[PDB]
Amino acid sequence: MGSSHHHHHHSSGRENLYFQGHLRELLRTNDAVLLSAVGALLDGADIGHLVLDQNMSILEGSLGVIPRRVLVHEDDLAGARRLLTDAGLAHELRSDD
């Protein structure tokens, strides 16, 4: 019981000497369409994102009781915001203020 799972991947490129954090806030909205657009953009580029603030059940959603907020991993913090600005829409973007 338990086959020999032996894989190997050699990669050592730890040149990132900074970035003490993890997550930063990008934008927010309750609009299902906008949330789908931004989601597809980040998902399509394999960008580690977080749009799950709170999620209302799929049994007929409300008009604006549950708003979501879009964060991404600081690994691609500038990259995701670059994408959303350059080839997304650039509008509801907020900073870590």
Does the 21-97 domain belong in CATH 3.30.70.790? yes
Contacts (Cβ under 8 Å, ≥6 apart) of 74: 19, 21, 22, 23, 24
Q: What are phi and psi of 44, to 5 degrees?
A: -65, -25
How far apart, in whole angstroms, are the C-alpha atoms of residue 46 and residue 68?
20
Displacement of CA 3 from its chain's centroid (Å):
36
31 contact partners, CB below 8 Å, separation of at least 6 = none
Three-state DSSP state, 76: helix
CA distance 47 to 57: 25
- Give the orientation angle of helix 77-86 with respect to helix 32-44, to 10 degrees: 120
Map out the domains of the chain as residue ranges.
21-97
- The approach used to solve this structure was NMR
